[PDB]
Design brief:
part of a larger assembly; 13 chains; A: mainly alpha; 70% helix; 0% strand; J: 34 residues; 1 helix; binds digalactosyl diacyl glycerol (dgdg); binds chlorophyll A; binds pheophytin A; binds 1,2-distearoyl-monogalactosyl-diglyceride; photosynthesis; photosynthesis complex; Photosystem II reaction center protein T; Psb-gama_linker
């Protein structure tokens, strides 16, 4: 069952990377 | 005295 | 600011904020006491380290009895 | 003015080498530590502590010469020259490894003095003291590895000896007896160090490749003047580049430099936590589930079990000569081997 | 007798002594 | 000055040379000579066993 | 043969800091949207 | 009692949120094997 | 707005809410103490005080309760194993309930101080803006701490108006809570003298009382006030963190190396007692003395107490556990049931063979049997290696003296090599591993866990001392240059 | 007074007359002179 | 007596809804404080 | 893309927060015995 | 171990009641 936890953690990390890339705060000149 |  | 019996009782203890003694005050006394404390710490450290053997002293579990 | 004031004025003079109040602790301690290390690697032997030759006088080179740790008979003694072990005899003090204690103690106080020097100089130039907080990383490394680890162990003997091959031995010894690669805090330390090197290289290349054309010469080092209010490289171009190459990029120069500061410091502090854990043999040596699986299944093998076997081989084949005080005598039959498995 | 002078000779008189000692070590029989 | 150095530095280098060639380094630092690593009675590696008798133990080991 | 609270520790030590960060970010965005 | 003048608002930008989520998930990945032992 | 890592700095210039948050932290700490004590009581088994002590069951706060007088439960049992007719309110359960009630009262006080933050006491009479006269506060609290220290040393420890402290023998066989008289000579400074604790607390309390009187009466010099930033709370924080990690390092050292304040019956043996064979030498001495009296070997070994033999076991070494090997030592190597007795190995030649003890440094150590001449006579091959000194070949036979197996001799190679493997761990002991599903991997004693936690805490607090001292000394340039 | 206690007190003096006293002398001497 | 799953069910079932409500309330209070 | 006109703020008053916390804790108390069986 | 969960849930419910009573939104006439 620990394999489920490992896979869940890995995909959560990958999803966090995906959201950080494609949903970041858009840089603008101030 | 008192420090400033 | 609320006034209370305990507040008025303890007010003089928190009244002289920023009040300082002139110049170096009692700094030499503080330095001398710090030097004595450093010597005492060195003595007790070297006793536990066994680098210092006071007579009548045995830093060991067997000294318990 | 007062003696202090005049002494403070003299110590704060703009000379070639800033002395300061912290210099009174830094210069003698650091000088004595470095000189003692040179003396130990040049003349002092390790024959009566480790059963080894570690001096240029004995025939060692730069790699194999070291200031070896004291004998395992000394314990966690301060090994003062006037202490009961040496009793004022310089020769016996050097033979028992007291020069290692000399170097370690005066070097720890030299590190403290250098940290205080960073603090002092930062207070005079008027800048935030983010140095002497970065140096807290190396200070923690030295304290955990050279002081806290032997204090948690049997004696100063198991501390790292001050030498190249001695440091390599210490690495392999810790790997064999603790499986320190498997330690998660060491993993965080490795990540911090490698990420800091990555940040240094990538930031240098990014700045060098995003400079403004501020000069007519092909060599662009002259186009930067010392008092330059304008930025010498394009932050917007660098941001766009990494935003569209890596998917994310720095937009704040401040944050970027704080991150380049933070990564190695955090890595060093995590590794220090791991070494402090190792000091009491509280190590992430093995996974219980994997050991149980391998015990009840001879056909179950992973690289972790191979690492366990390698560590066992390291311990068994290095115990006899690495710890001569224990008088380990291991017959060839009990020495682990691949064929023996 | 300046701080630079004293620091230099502190880092020079042992340096030359150790260089001479190591040069002598190079001609030991071994 | 340079003149001074032209005498002090070579003399200091020769003194450093003689500190090793005359055998004073072995006596001062206790480093064993190549012919006195193992004595006739003690063919094993000499190791200190007690911290509080280390001086006497080293005197016994290095007596021969 | 793994432990049991082990799962509890992993899941909670993942969730407790994640929901804290998400709550803080949502609060900050709420302040930004209200002021703007 | 009364309105306190020390109250200040807290801000977490998105970069900080993503840094925190990445740190927590990476620490979980690292220490899950050791917690499961 | 404020970043996430500066939020609590809102209570910096608010003495009332600073007191509120400190009250909240004290409430949390007291509640943790009470809850941990209750959980340990729910877990603790007082059935076998000698072979299943508190330090073998993972008890952490119970040793600290027992070190200064709490030894009985409302369940009719005591740590020493002596049944108590009327326990008394101040049992472990009573202490836990008192700490929980104190946590609740501190929580209510924190709520009140947070709500009622604006008090005239916290505002300077000269200028309305709130302020704290840190030197006078330090003097008052130092006088309070000196009074508490003198009271603890003179009344609680000496037993004049207290229970005393935990005192054990040199080998942790007969220890209990008793009063100690102060030792004012040099003999009060070695860490292994309980009288030194009483003399220390009395003298230090008197000195602290005098120092508090001074720091109340005398204002600081202007030079020190400007140098140390004494009008700033952050310099107090930095100095307190410095003293706190200093004390943490000292307590870590005393716990790891051993002291009169770290009894072996409460925290377990130290690693240096196994390194030097502290209990093995005593056991051999006792056996030799019994033999010299004329007693036979079986009678001499039947004289060795089970507790003393259990102390000479490498599974009780604090340096044999793991970082992620969680739980009590009973979860590690099973619960000890009885002593099997001292084994003696003899070859076909009859030479006494001794199994070399496993050093704490070795996760796996070879099984080696040596005679009085230290010559290797028998061994167990690594895995499946060709052997010339195998136990089946040398014909080693083992005989047990004392314990359950007293008078029993074993010849079968398998049982002899099993007993040799068990004897490389020190005195042979029988364990049951079914009640806790033990895994056979050694755990760490509470001594080692305390040492690890507080050493890491001391290092992190050295980092905190550096950061907060830099903050208070370079405040002016913090927003930037 | 064990030989250890004597070594300790002599250690204290040597630190005063070889490290503390000389190094400060220079600081007071050279600071006052400049 | 059930496995850490029963423990995981009770502890997560309690926390996931609790932290959602706390986040929503903090967001609402943040908007209220920002607009006033 | 662009600004979405259907965006609306979401509010939960303190009374609603306490109602929700009480409901969740009471449901947990009720169903904990059955989950533990 | 389930007794610790039961006690935690009961104490949490009591604390929720306490905070609902003494930290409610103060009723005001508008
Ligand atoms: C960052 C800020 C700091 C910056 C760097 C500062 C660098 C300067 C200071 C570095 C050196 C400090 C002194 C260390 C000396 C020491 O440790 O000396 C050690 C002595 C104890 O000595 C040891 O004691 C052990 C226990 O012995 C006892 O038990 C034995 C059992 O057989 C015997 O019975 C024996 O007779 C009995 O004394 C063993 O005997 C060892 O062989 C012996 O070496 O403690 C003592 O002097 C005093 C013990 C009180 C604690 C003070 C040090 C605390 C530091 C952590 C200590 C390690 C804890 C684990 C860390 C992981
Ligand atoms: C910044 C200066 C500095 C500092 C911090 C140290 C610090 C240290 N030295 Mg080093 N040392 C220094 C300068 C310094 N030294 C210099 C200049 C020399 C050349 C002479 C040496 C030569 C030296 C040797 C040869 C040895 C040390 C050793 C030591 C350690 C033990 C100190 C001790 O117990 O002595 C005790 C004495 C003192 C602490 C002097 C204090 C005097 C007090 C404060 C004045 C009051 C005296 C009192 C009123 C009289 C009673 C310690 C880490 C020993 C060590 O640990 O090596 C393993 C050792 O063997 N030092
Ligand atoms: C009426 C007050 C009171 C009493 C009688 C107790 C009694 C007890 N507590 Mg509790 N506790 C209290 C308040 C109290 N507590 C509060 C308010 C808190 C919250 C902070 C706690 C938090 C707490 C925890 C977390 C734990 C206890 C524990 C204990 C037990 C062991 C105590 C021990 O070893 O302390 C040892 C204390 C020390 C060694 C500290 C010494 C003081 C230092 C050295 C001062 C240093 C600075 C000083 C100012 C310098 C002085 C200068 C000098 C010149 C004078 C004991 C039954 C332990 C236990 O068994 O669990 C239940 C435990 O783990 N308590
Ligand atoms: C000074 C702190 C301290 C110390 C020394 C101890 C010591 C002990 N405790 Mg106690 N405990 C403490 C604080 C402490 N406790 C606190 C604060 C709590 C409340 C949560 C508890 C609750 C508690 C319980 C409920 C139990 C213990 C038990 C124990 C014993 C074994 C613990 C063990 O094996 O550790 C194992 C430790 C680990 C496997 C990990 C430790 C943390 C490492 C260093 C990594 C953590 C950082 C890392 C980045 C986290 C990653 C998070 C990621 C998922 C995001 C031992 C006597 C047990 C026992 O036998 O008592 C009867 C037991 O059942 N403790
Ligand atoms: C008595 C101890 C003490 C006290 C009162 C303070 C108080 C303060 N510190 Mg200092 N600090 C301390 C110890 C202490 N610190 C130590 C030991 C370290 C080294 C790690 C630091 C490192 C440090 C830094 C680097 C900074 C502060 C800052 C601050 C300020 C704001 C803290 C904040 O909002 O955190 C908010 C924290 C959170 C929202 C979550 C943090 C949760 C942590 C990461 C893990 C969880 C810990 C756990 C719940 C309980 C720990 C157990 C305990 C025994 C340690 C405040 C004045 C900050 C400041 O304002 O200065 C400019 C700042 O930048 N401190
Ligand atoms: C790397 C180490 C380091 C650094 C950079 C700092 C830096 C700082 N500290 Mg901290 N501190 C440290 C270690 C350190 N400290 C340690 C280990 C302690 C003991 C717990 C303290 C205790 C402390 C207090 C109580 C205070 C400071 C303060 C300060 C600040 C002013 C400078 C000062 O007072 O220096 C302090 C001087 C030194 C660290 C030098 C010590 C040199 C000693 C005296 C020589 C000993 C020689 C002798 C032979 C030793 C023998 C040992 C041998 C037996 C092994 C500054 C931010 C003060 C401040 O203003 O806070 C904002 C303040 O109030 N610190
Ligand atoms: C092995 C790697 C390594 C070395 C050799 C090293 C060395 C140095 N870094 C310094 C600075 C720094 N290090 C920093 C970050 C880092 N430094 C790192 C890793 C290292 N740093 C890492 C990983 C980081 C990231 C956190 C910063 C931020 C600074 C500085 O501010 C400072 C500087 O200005 O550098 C530019 C200098 C400290 C001078 C000093 O203490 O006063 C004099 C020297 C003393 C007191 C040491 C003598 C005593 C030593 C500890 C024991 C004796 C050692 C022998 C002499 C030699 C033994 C050799 C064998 C081990 C092989 C020195 C040149
Ligand atoms: C809410 C806030 C926390 C959220 C969750 C955080 C999760 C991440 C942190 C988890 C740490 C503990 C994981 C243990 C997993 C486990 O298997 O537990 C299993 C063990 C319990 O072990 C069980 O005990 C039982 C009797 O109680 C039985 O004997 C069982 O047989 C036995 O397995 O749990 C613990 O021991 C936890 C102890 C934690 C004590 C503090 C750590 C030690 C001191 C170091 C302090 C830090 C020092 C600096 C570090 C840098
Ligand atoms: C084709 C692209 C291929 C790669 C795509 C993925 C790479 C990009 C990843 C983005 C997320 C990382 C940053 C998050 C946080 C975030 O959103 O950062 C945003 C941040 C930009 O922030 P700003 O400069 O705008 O911040 C201004 C400050 O005021 C804010 O405090 O970017 C960086 O700081 C540099 C990032 C370093 C790179 C870190 C890489 C970490 C990799 C971890 C991998 C784990 C793998 C585990 C596998 C199981
Ligand atoms: C060729 C080469 C290639 C690569 C580049 C390169 C590295 C630059 C180069 C190397 C060149 C080389 C080889 C450079 C090497 C230069 C050398 C060997 C310098 C030696 C300096 C010795 C010192 C400072 C000893 C001082 C003694 C002291 C302080 C005594 C201390 C004492 C001790 C023992 C303890 C007791 C107390 C006292 C009395 C205090
Ligand atoms: C309110 C009140 C008023 C009157 C009525 C009343 C009901 C009687 C009363 C209530 C009184 C009551 C019920 C009071 C009881 C209050 C309680 C139960 C307080 C609980 C405290 C727990 C703490 C501080 C644990 C902290 C864990 C930490 C720091 C992290 C630990 C670790 C982890 C896991 C993470 C990694 C680090 C390590 C160290 C490994
Ligand atoms: Cl392999």
């Amino acid at each position: 069952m620990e394999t489920l936890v490992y896979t869940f953690l890995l995909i959560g990390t990958l999803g966090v990377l995906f959201f950080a890339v494609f949903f970041r705060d858009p840089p603008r000149i101030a | 005295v008192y420090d400033e | 600011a609320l006034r209370t019996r305990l507040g008025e009782l303890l007010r003089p203890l928190n009244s002289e904020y920023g009040k300082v003694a002139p110049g170096w005050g009692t700094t030499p006394i503080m330095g001398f006491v710090m030097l004595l404390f450093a010597v005492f710490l060195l003595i007790i450290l070297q006793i536990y380290n066994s680098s210092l053997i006071i007579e009548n002293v045995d830093v060991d579990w067997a000294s318990l009895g | 003015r007062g003696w202090f004031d005049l002494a403070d004025d003299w110590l704060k003079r703009d000379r070639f080498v800033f002395v300061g109040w912290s210099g009174l602790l830094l210069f003698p301690t650091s000088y004595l530590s470095i000189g003692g290390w040179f003396t130990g690697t040049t003349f002092v032997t390790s024959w009566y502590t480790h059963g080894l030759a570690s001096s240029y006088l004995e025939g060692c080179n730069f790699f194999t010469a070291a200031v070896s740790t004291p004998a395992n008979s000394m314990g966690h003694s301060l090994l003062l020259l006037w202490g009961p072990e040496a009793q004022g005899d310089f020769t016996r003090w050097c033979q028992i490894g007291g020069l290692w204690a000399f170097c370690a103690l005066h070097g720890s106080f030299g590190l403290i003095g250098f940290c205080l020097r960073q603090f002092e100089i930062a207070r005079l130039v008027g800048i935030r003291p983010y140095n002497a907080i970065a140096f807290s990383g190396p200070i923690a490394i030295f304290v955990s590895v050279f002081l806290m680890y032997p204090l948690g162990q049997a004696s100063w003997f198991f501390a790292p000896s001050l030498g190249v091959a001695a440091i390599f031995r210490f690495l392999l010894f810790i790997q064999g007896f603790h499986n320190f690669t498997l330690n998660p805090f060491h993993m965080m330390g490795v990540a911090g160090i490698l990420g800091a090197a990555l940040l240094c290289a990538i930031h240098g290349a990014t700045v060098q490749n995003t400079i403004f054309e501020d000069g007519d010469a092909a060599n662009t080092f002259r186009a930067f003047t010392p008092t330059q209010a304008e930025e010498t490289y394009s932050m917007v171009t660098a941001n766009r580049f990494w935003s569209q190459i890596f998917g994310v990029a720095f937009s704040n120069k401040r944050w970027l430099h704080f991150f380049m500061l933070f990564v190695p410091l955090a890595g060093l502090w995590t590794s220090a936590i791991g070494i402090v854990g190792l000091a009491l043999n509280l190590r992430a040596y093995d996974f219980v589930s994997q050991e149980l699986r391998a015990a009840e299944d001879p056909e179950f093998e992973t690289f972790y079990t191979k690492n366990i076997l390698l560590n066992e081989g390291i311990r068994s084949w290095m115990a006899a000569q690495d710890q001569p005080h224990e008088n380990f005598i291991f017959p060839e039959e009990v020495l682990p081997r691949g064929n023996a498995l | 007798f300046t701080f630079r002078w004293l620091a230099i000779h502190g880092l020079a008189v042992p340096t030359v002594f150790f260089l001479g000692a190591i040069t002598s070590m190079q001609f030991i029989q071994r | 000055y340079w003149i001074i150095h032209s005498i002090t530095i070579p003399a200091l280098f020769v003194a450093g040379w003689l500190f090793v060639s005359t055998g004073l380094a072995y006596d001062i630092f206790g480093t064993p000579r190549p012919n006195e690593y193992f004595t006739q009675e003690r063919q094993q590696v000499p190791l200190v066993n007690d911290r509080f008798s280390a001086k006497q133990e080293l005197e016994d080991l290095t007596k021969g | 043969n793994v432990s049991v609270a082990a799962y509890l520790a992993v899941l909670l030590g993942t969730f407790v800091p994640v929901v804290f960060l998400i709550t803080l970010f949502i609060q900050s965005e709420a302040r930004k949207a209200a002021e703007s | 009692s009364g309105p306190n003048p020390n109250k200040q608002p807290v801000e977490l930008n998105r970069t900080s949120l993503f840094w925190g989520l990445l740190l927590i998930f990476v620490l979980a990945v690292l220490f899950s094997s050791y917690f499961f032992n | 707005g404020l970043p996430w890592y500066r939020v609590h700095t809102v209570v910096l210039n608010d003495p009332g809410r600073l007191i509120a948050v400190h009250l909240m932290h004290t409430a949390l700490v007291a509640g943790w103490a009470g809850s941990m004590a209750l959980y340990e009581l729910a877990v603790f088994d007082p059935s076998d005080p000698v072979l299943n002590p508190m330090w073998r069951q993972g008890m952490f706060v119970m040793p600290f309760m027992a070190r200064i007088g709490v030894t009985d439960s409302w369940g009719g049992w005591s740590i020493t194993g002596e049944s108590v007719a009327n326990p008394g309110f101040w049992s472990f359960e009573g202490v836990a309930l008192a700490h929980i009630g104190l946590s609740g009262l501190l929580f209510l006080a924190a709520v009140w101080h947070w709500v009622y933050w604006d008090l005239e006491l916290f505002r300077d009479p000269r200028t309305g803006n709130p302020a704290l006269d840190l030197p006078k506060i330090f003097g008052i609290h130092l006088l309070l701490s000196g009074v508490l220290c003198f009271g603890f040393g003179a009344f609680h420890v000496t037993g004049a108006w207290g229970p005393g402290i935990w005192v054990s023998d040199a080998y942790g066989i007969t220890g209990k809570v008793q009063p100690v008289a102060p030792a004012w000579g040099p003999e009060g400074f070695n860490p292994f003298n309980p009288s030194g604790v009483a003399s220390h607390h009395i003298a230090a309390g008197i000195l602290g009382f005098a120092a508090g009187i001074f720091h109340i009466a005398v204002r600081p010099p202007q030079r020190l006030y400007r140098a140390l930033r004494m009008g700033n709370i952050e310099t107090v924080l930095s100095s307190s963190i410095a003293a706190v990690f200093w004390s943490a390092f000292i307590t870590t050292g005393t716990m790891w190396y051993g002291s009169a304040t770290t009894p072996i019956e409460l925290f377990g043996p130290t690693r240096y007692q196994w390194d030097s064979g502290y209990f093995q030498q005593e056991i051999e001495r006792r056996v030799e003395n019994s033999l010299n009296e004329g007693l036979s070997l079986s009678e001499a070994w039947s004289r060795i107490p089970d507790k003393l033999a259990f102390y000479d076991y490498v599974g009780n070494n604090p340096a044999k556990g793991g970082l992620f090997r969680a739980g009590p030592m009973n979860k590690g190597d099973g619960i000890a049931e009885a002593w099997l007795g001292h084994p003696i190995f003899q070859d076909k030649e009859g030479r006494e063979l001794t199994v070399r003890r496993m050093p704490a440094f070795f996760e796996t150590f070879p099984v080696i049997l040596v005679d009085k001449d230290g010559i290797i006579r028998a061994d167990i091959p690594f895995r499946r290696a060709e052997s010339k000194y195998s136990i089946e070949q040398v014909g080693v036979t083992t005989s047990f003296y004392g314990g359950k197996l007293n008078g029993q001799v074993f010849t079968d190679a398998p049982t002899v090599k099993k007993y040799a493997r068990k004897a490389q761990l020190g005195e042979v002991m029988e364990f049951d591993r079914t009640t806790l599903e033990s895994d056979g991997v050694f755990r760490s004693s509470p001594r080692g866990w305390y040492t690890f936690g507080h050493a890491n805490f001391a290092l992190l607090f050295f980092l905190g001392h550096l950061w907060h001292g830099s903050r208070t000394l370079f405040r002016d340039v913090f927003s930037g240059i | 007074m064990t030989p250890s206690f004597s070594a300790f007190i002599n250690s204290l003096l040597a630190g005063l007359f070889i490290v503390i006293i000389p190094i400060g002398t220079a600081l007071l001497i050279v600071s006052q002179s400049d």
